[PDB]
From a paper:
Cell division in most bacteria is regulated by the tubulin homolog FtsZ as well as ZapA, a FtsZ-associated protein. In the presence of GTP, FtsZ polymerizes into protofilaments, which further associate into a ring-like structure (the Z-ring). ZapA binds FtsZ straight protofilaments preferentially to crosslink FtsZ protofilaments; thereby, ZapA bundles more aligned and straight filaments constituting a coherent Z-ring. A FtsZ protofilament has polarity and lacks symmetry, while ZapA is in an equilibrium between homodimer and homotetramer, which are related by C2 and D2 symmetry, respectively.
In this study, we report the high-resolution cryo-EM structure of the K. pneumoniae ZapA-FtsZ complex. The cryo-EM structure of the ZapA-FtsZ complex reveals an asymmetric ladder-like architecture, in which the double antiparallel FtsZ protofilament on one side and a single protofilament on the other side are tethered by ZapA tetramers. After removing the duplicated particles, we performed helix refine with D1 symmetry, namely with a single C2 axis perpendicular to the helical axis but no rotational symmetry along the helical axis, and reached an overall map resolution of 2.73 Å with an optimized helical rise of 44.58 Å and a helical twist of −3.11°. The well-resolved FtsZ double protofilament structure enabled us to confirm that all FtsZ monomers are in the T conformation with GMPCPP bound and that the two FtsZ protofilaments are antiparallel. In the ZapA-FtsZ interface, the ZapA dimer head (chains G, H) interacted with two pairs of FtsZ dimers from two antiparallel protofilaments (chains A, B, and E, F). The N-terminal region of FtsZ (residues 1–10) was sandwiched between two ZapA molecules. The interface area of the ZapA dimer head (chains G, H) with two pairs of FtsZ dimers is extensive (2105.4 Å2) with a ΔG of dissociation of −17.0 kcal/mol, as compared with the interface area and a ΔG of dissociation between two FtsZ molecules within a FtsZ protofilament, which are 1390.6 Å2 and −16.0 kcal/mol, respectively. This feature is rationalized by the electrostatic repulsions among Glu238 and Glu305 found in the inter-protofilament interactions. The entire structure of the FtsZ protofilament with ZapA was roughly similar to that without ZapA (r.m.s.d. = 1.53 Å among 918 Cα atoms for three KpFtsZ molecules within a protofilament), but ZapA binding induces structural changes in a FtsZ molecule as well as an adjacent FtsZ molecule. When comparing the structures of FtsZ within the ZapA-FtsZ complex and that of FtsZ straight protofilaments alone (PDB code: 8IBN15), approximately 2–3 Å shifts of the β2-α2 loop and the α1-β2 loop are observed (indicated by red and green arrows in Fig. 4).
Author numbering:
A (entry chain A), E (entry chain B), F (entry chain F), G (entry chain E): 1 to 316
B (entry chain I), H (entry chain J): 85 to 103
C (entry chain G), D (entry chain H), I (entry chain L): 3 to 90
C-alpha cells in the first residue's frame, strides 16, 4: 500500500499526580482534553482516587493506611511509596520523560514525590516536578514539611517548578472563584506539558527534538516552561513576552538559566524580522554560558497566529 | 441446444469487444 | 467546451468537459474526494503538498491490477470459444 | 516500511512501500509521468497547480469504465455456468 | 549508426547537506530543479531526513542517537560521523568534486562536516564547503562552536565559503519573509554549484575545463563563486559586476585571491570590447601573483544575453 | 425522531468580485477556505474569469467586448453591466446582504460596481462595497476615474470601505513581496466578511443578530469592519485595540461613526472586567448620538483565546 | 475528456515586409524564430521575393513592372499596389493588428506602404508601421521621397515608428559589420512585435489585454515599443530604463505620449518595491492627460529575471 | 467432451474470483 | 566509438561510427558528394546555405519510392507462395 509519510516523532510522556493536589492538577488536564500524554493518579486516599476523573489510578500503601490519607505525615507517605515501588516502576516504565505533580506540605505528596522521582531516575527517565507550596495561613509546620520535601525532591529530579500558593491571592484579584484560582495554578503544568509535547513531536524548519530537551535539562535546577500566542502587527513581541512571563511562579531570575530552548510556530508568512524579534527577546536574558537552541516550525495550520514556546532550566 | 450457445457467445463477445 | 467548476479536497479546479462526461466527472470527483479524505488521517502530520500524488499512484496500481484481467479473461474465453466453434 | 524515493513530474516524493509492491510503484510512476507529460503538452499556458488533479480524475474515470466490466462479465459467465451445470 | 558528436564533458559533482541547515540548502536546489548534479542529505535526525525533499539520504549515527539529533553537541556529531564513515565513503566515492553544505553552530553539522571533508580529501576529491554562521541572537556559545568547527573544516577542504547569517538582517530589508530570506542564502550555494557545473561540462571557444578548476583550487583558503547575467548596451559591464558581487558573504577582499577563473558566455555577436571590459573588471582586483584564466563560450542558445561566471579562491 | 436543537441562524451573504481587482480579492478568500459564504466573479475579461479560482462566474458584456476587457473605459464597463443585468439579478437574488469587491480606476470595475450595487438596492439587499483606490504612480486620470466611480458607487450602497492602494507602500515595509502586499489588502475584505457572518449566525448570551446589522447599516457612509483576537493577561484590551485598528484603510475618524456594533466572544471564564474594558474601548470613540450595540458569546469551543469583532458605520 | 484549462488568449498579428527593406526586416524575425506571428513579403521585384526566407510572398504589380522593381518611382509602387489590392486584402483579412515594415525612400516601399495601410484601415485593423529613413549620403531626393511617403503613410496608420538610418553610423560604432548594423535596426521591429504579442496573449495578475492595446493606440501619432530584461539587485530599475531606451529611434519626447501601456513579468518573488520602482519610472515621463495602464504577470518560468514591456503612443 | 468443459470452467471462475 | 573525420562538399564533419559501418559511411559520403556536386550547377546563383536540404529531400523521395516495393513484392510473393503451398 502506497502510504504518505508520517513526519511526527514518537514520544512517551507521563504525568503523575501524587496526593490530592497532584491529582487535582492532573485532573485539570484530563478535563481539558490534552492529547498524546499518559495520565496517572497516585495516592494513599481511596476516596480521592475514586473521586478523580483521572482514569488510571495507583493506590499506594494499602497495607499501611488501609485506604486512608497519610494524615499530614511525610514519613507515612514515604513508607507507602516504598511499599508499592514495584507498581510505580511498572506503571512508569518505558517513558522518555515524566511530569510529577504534587502539592506539597502534607503527608502523601511531600514524602511520596521524592520516591517516585527516585524510581524514575533509577529507571533512567528525565524528570520534571511541578509542585505547589502551602498557603501562608496553613502554618509554619506545613511550610517546613513542604520545604524539606522539596529538598528531597530536588535530590532526584532534573528540573523542578515551584508555584507558591500564596501568589494566587496577590495576582488573581479578589472576587475570583476558588475553582478558577486553582485552575490558574494548574495551567502552569498544563502549559508545560503541552508545550514540551508539541516541541518534541511536531517537526520544524529548524528542527528541535528530544535530544535538545535532554541537553538543556541535563543539569539540575529550577525551571520555567510555558507558551505564548499572539496575532496582529506585534504578534512576535507579544507572543515572546507571554512565553517568558510567569506571574504565578516563585520569584525567578531568568538570567541565571543555563539552558534555553525556544520554538517558534507560525504560518509560511512568518517574516524574518519577527524571528529576529523573538530571538532578541530570548537573548535579553540568556547568559553567555547558557546553551540556547532556537527552533522554527512553519505550519499551514496556523492561519495568522504566532506561538512561542520557551523552556528555561538550570536556574538557581 | 449446445449448437446455439457458442453462436450467441460470439454476439456477447462482440458487445464485450466494443465495450 | 463549457468549462465546468469543481471543488475537490479544498482546492477549486476548472475543467472543460464534453456534456456527456459531466456525470462521470462528478462521480470521479466524489471518488477522488473520498480517496484523499481517507488519505488525510492515515498520518497525523505529513507533507500534504504530496498527498494527491499518492492518491494518484494508488489508483494507478489499482487500475493496472484490474486492467490486466481485461486481456486475461478475454484471451481465455476466446480460445474456449474458437475451440468449441471448431468441434461443433 | 522501508521508505523509498520517487521523482515524478519534477517533484520529489517519499513513500513507504511494502517490498512486494515496489515494481508496481515504479510502473505507476512511469504511467503517471507519461500522463502528466501528455497533459502539459495539451496546453500552452495553464494552471500547473491543478494538473495532477486532472491526471487523477482522468484515471479514475478510466478506472471505473473498465472496472464495471469486472462484475459485468462476471455475472454473465456465472449465470451461463450455473445454467450449463443445471442442464448437465 | 552515424551519430553526431557529443561535445559535452563528463563530470561527477556531489552536493551533501549535513545537518538541518545543509539539508535545507540542498533541498532548495532540489526544488529549483538543477540538472546534472547528485543530491544527498546526511543527518542524525530521522525526522528531518524524512521531511526533506532531498532524495538520497544517509542517516548517520543511528547507534549513538537512535534517530535523534545531536542536541547541540559537536562531539556527538563527530562520533556519529565516525561510526558511519563507510556509508559516506560509499556514497561519495567516484566523484570529481563535492560541495558540502552545513549550517554550523549546532551538533550534527559542526562536528560532522569535518569528517565528511576528511573522507573526501583522503579519497582524493576536490572539496568545496559552503557553511553558514549562526545568528547574533543565538548566543556566544553557538558562535564559538561554529568557529571551532570552521577551524576544523578548513583542514580538509580546498576552498571554503562562509555566509554570516547576520547579513540577512542587514541586506534583505524589513518585511522579507523567513522563507525568502533563507532562499537568498541558499542561492549562494545554488549559484556556485550551477556555475561550476556549466563551466566544467559545456565547451567554449577559449576552453576552460576541470584542470583549470583544479589548478585554481589548489590553494587553500576562502573562496567566492557566482554568476551574472545581463542584456542591453551595458550587458558586459553589468554582468561582470554582478558576478563578483557577494552581498551575503562575509566581508571579503578579492585582491587577496590567488586564483581567478572567468567564463564568458554569449551569442556569436559578442563584441571584442565586451570581452575586454569583462577582462578589465577581472583585472581590477586580480593580484600579480594570481593565476587568472579567462574563458569564452559563444552559444547560439543565448539570444541576446551575456553570462559571466567568476570563481576566485585562495582568499585570506 | 429525537432531534437535538440547532442554535445557528440562517444567513445569505454574497461576495462579488467585479473586474480584475475584485476577482483577486474574492479569490483570496476562496483560497483561504472561508465557509458559509457564496463567492462570485463578474468581469468582461474571459481570460481573467477562466484564470480565477472563483468557481461560479458571470461574464458580462459578451456582446460589447467579445470577451475582452473594458480597456480602461468606465462607460464600456457600465454598458457591459447594463447588457447583462438579468444575470446579475438572477445570481444575486434571495440575498440578505452582499459584499461587492472592486478595484476602482479601470473600466470594468469602476463603471460596473455601481450597476451591481443598483441591482442589489433595487432588489432590497443590504450592500457593502469594499474597493481599492489606484496607486500613486498609475496617473492622475486613473485616480480621477476611480473617484468618479466611487461617487457613483456611494449612491447605491449602504456602507463603503475604501482601501488606498498607496498605503501598502507605507505600512508593509520595504522588502515585502507583491503577493503578500496584495494579501494584506485582501484581508480587509476577508475579515469584514468573516466577522459579519460569524456575528449573524452564531448565538450569544447578549444576542446580536441581523436586525442589529440592518439598524447600524441604515445610513449611508464610510465604514470599517474587522476582528481582533488575543490571549494572556491583557487579552481583552489587546483584542479591542486590534479590532479597531485599520492600518490600510483611508484616514478615518471613528468618532464620526453613527453606528457601532461589537461582539465579544470567549470561553466561560470571561471576567466582568474584561467585558468592561472592551466596552470602555468602544466608548472611547463612540459619539453620544450613535447607536452602540454590545454583544457577548460565551463559547466552550473557544479556549483561553478571546475575540472581539467591531462594525462601525456612518463615518464621513 | 477531462482537459486542463487554456489561459492563453487568441490574437491575429500580421507583419508585412513591403519592398526590399521591409522584406529584410521581416526575414530577420523569420530567421530569429519568433512564434505566434504570420509573416509576409510584399514586393514588385521577383528576384528579391525569391531570395527572402519569408515563406508567404505577395508579388504586386506583375502587370506593370513584369517582375522588376519600381525603379525608385513612388508612383509606380502606388500603381502596382492598387493593381493587386485584392491579394493584399485577402492575405490581410481577419487580422486583429498588422505591423507594416518598409524601408522608405525608394519606389516600391514608399508608394506601396500607404496602400497596404489603407487596405488595413478600411478592413478595420489596428495598424502599426515601422519604417526607416534613407541614409544621409543617399541624396536629397531620396529623403524627400521618403518624407512625402511617410506623410502619406501617417494618414492610414494608428501608430508609426520611424528609424533614421543615419543613427546606425552614430550609435553602433566604427567597425560594426553591415549585417550587424542592419540587425540592430531590425531588432526594433522584432522587439515591438514580440512584446505586443506576449502582452496580448499570456495572462497576468493585473491583466492587460487587446482592449488596452486598442485604447492606447486610438490616438494617431508616433510610437515607441520595446522590452527590457534584467536580473540581480537592481533588476527592476535596469529593466525599466532598458524598456524606454530607444538609441536608434528618431529623437523622441516620451512626455508627449497620450497613452502608455506597461507590463511587468517576473517570478512570484517580485517584491512590492520593484513594482513601485517600475511604476515610478513610467510616471517620470507620463503626462497628466495620458492613459497609463500598468500590468503585472507573475510567471514561474521567469526564474530570477524581470521583463518590462512598455508601449507608448500618441507622441508628436 | 462437453461434460468436462463446464467443470473446468468452474475452476477458471474460481481463479477469477480470487483474482 | 572511434570518431571518424569526413570532408564532404567543402565542409569538414566529425562522426563516430561502429567499425563495421566505416566503408558504408565512405560510400554514403561519395554518394552525397556527387549529389551535391550535381546540385551546384543546376543553378548558377542560389541560396547555397540550403543546398544540403534539397540533397536530403531528394533522397528521401528516392527512398520512399524504392522502399514501398519492399512490402509490395513481399505481399505479392507471400500470396503466391502460400497459394502454391495449399495446392500442392
Ligand atoms: N493549588 C492547589 N493547591 C492545593 C490543592 N490541594 C491542596 N493544595 C495545597 O497543597 C498542600 C498539600 O495538601 P494535599 O491535600 O494535596 C496533601 P496529600 O493529600 O498529598 O497528603 P495527605 O492527605 O496528608 O496524605 C495543601 O496544604 C495546599 O496548600 C489544590 O487542589 N490546588
Ligand atoms: N540560512 C539558514 N540557516 C539555518 C537554517 N537552519 C539552521 N540554520 C543556522 O545554522 C545553525 C545550525 O543549526 P542546525 O539546526 O542546522 C544544527 P544541526 O541540525 O546540523 O545539528 P543538531 O540538530 O544539533 O544535531 C543554526 O543555529 C542557524 O543559525 C536554515 O534553514 N537556513
Ligand atoms: N490590491 C490590489 N489592487 C489591484 C489589483 N489589481 C488591480 N488593482 C488596482 O485596481 C486598479 C484597477 O485595475 P483592475 O485591473 O482591477 C481594472 P478592471 O479589470 O476592473 O477593468 P478593465 O480591465 O479595464 O476592464 C488598478 O489600477 C490597481 O491599482 C490586485 O490584485 N490587488
Ligand atoms: N536598415 C536597412 N535599411 C535598408 C535596407 N534596404 C534598404 N534600406 C534603406 O531603405 C531605403 C529604401 O530602399 P529599398 O531598396 O528598401 C526600396 P524598395 O526595394 O522598397 O523599392 P524599389 O526597389 O525602388 O522598387 C534605401 O535607400 C535604404 O536607405 C536594409 O536591409 N536595412
Ligand atoms: K521537533
Ligand atoms: K568547458
Ligand atoms: K447572533
Ligand atoms: K494579457
Ligand atoms: Mg490526602
Ligand atoms: Mg538537528
Ligand atoms: Mg480587466
Ligand atoms: Mg526593389
Amino acid at each position: 500500500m502506497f502510504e504518505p509519510m508520517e513526519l511526527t516523532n514518537d514520544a512517551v510522556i507521563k504525568v503523575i499526580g501524587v496526593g490530592g493536589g497532584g491529582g487535582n492538577a492532573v485532573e485539570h488536564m484530563v478535563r481539558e482534553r490534552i492529547e498524546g500524554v499518559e495520565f496517572f493518579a497516585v495516592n494513599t486516599d481511596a476516596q480521592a482516587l475514586r473521586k478523580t476523573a483521572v482514569g488510571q489510578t495507583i493506590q499506594i500503601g494499602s497495607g499501611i493506611t488501609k485506604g486512608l490519607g497519610a494524615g499530614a505525615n511525610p514519613e507515612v507517605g514515604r513508607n507507602a511509596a516504598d511499599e508499592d515501588r514495584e507498581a510505580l516502576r511498572a506503571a512508569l516504565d518505558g517513558a522518555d520523560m515524566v511530569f510529577i505533580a504534587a502539592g506539597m506540605g502534607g503527608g502523601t505528596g511531600t514524602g511520596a514525590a521524592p520516591v517516585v522521582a527516585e524510581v524514575a531516575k533509577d529507571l533512567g527517565i528525565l524528570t520534571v516536578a511541578v509542585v505547589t507550596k502551602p498557603f501562608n495561613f496553613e502554618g509554619k509546620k506545613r511550610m517546613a514539611f513542604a520545604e524539606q520535601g522539596i529538598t528531597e525532591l530536588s535530590k532526584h529530579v532534573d528540573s523542578l517548578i515551584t508555584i507558591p500558593n500564596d501568589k494566587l491571592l496577590k495576582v488573581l484579584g479578589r472576587g475570583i472563584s476558588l475553582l478558577d484560582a486553582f485552575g490558574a495554578a494548574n495551567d502552569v503544568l498544563k502549559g508545560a506539558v503541552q508545550g514540551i509535547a508539541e516541541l518534541i513531536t511536531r517537526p520544524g524548519l529548524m528542527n528541535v527534538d528530544f535530544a535538545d530537551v535532554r541537553t538543556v535539562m541535563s543539569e539540575m535546577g529550577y525551571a520555567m516552561m510555558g507558551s505564548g500566542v499572539a496575532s496582529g502587527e506585534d504578534r512576535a513581541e507579544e507572543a515572546a513576552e507571554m512565553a517568558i512571563s510567569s506571574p504565578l511562579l516563585e520569584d525567578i531570575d531568568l538570567s541565571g538559566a543555563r539552558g534555553v530552548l525556544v520554538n517558534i510556530t507560525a504560518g509560511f508568512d512568518l517574516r524574518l524580522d519577527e524571528f529576529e524579534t523573538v530571538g532578541n527577546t530570548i537573548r535579553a536574558f540568556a547568559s553567555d554560558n547558557a546553551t540556547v537552541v532556537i527552533g522554527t516550525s512553519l505550519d499551514p495550520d496556523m492561519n495568522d497566529e504566532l506561538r512561542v514556546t520557551v523552556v528555561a532550566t538550570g536556574i538557581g | 441446444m449446445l449448437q446455439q450457445t457458442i453462436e450467441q457467445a460470439l454476439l456477447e463477445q462482440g458487445r464485450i469487444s466494443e465495450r | 467546451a463549457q468549462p465546468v467548476d469543481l471543488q475537490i479536497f479544498g482546492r477549486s479546479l476548472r475543467v472543460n468537459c464534453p456534456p456527456e462526461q459531466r456525470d462521470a466527472l462528478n462521480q470521479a470527483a466524489e471518488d477522488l474526494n473520498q480517496r484523499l479524505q481517507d488519505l488525510k488521517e492515515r498520518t497525523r502530520v505529513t507533507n500534504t503538498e504530496q498527498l494527491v500524488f499518492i492518491a494518484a499512484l494508488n489508483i494507478s496500481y489499482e487500475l493496472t491490477q484490474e486492467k490486466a484481467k481485461t486481456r486475461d479473461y478475454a484471451s481465455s474465453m476466446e480460445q474456449r470459444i474458437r475451440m468449441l466453434q471448431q468441434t461443433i
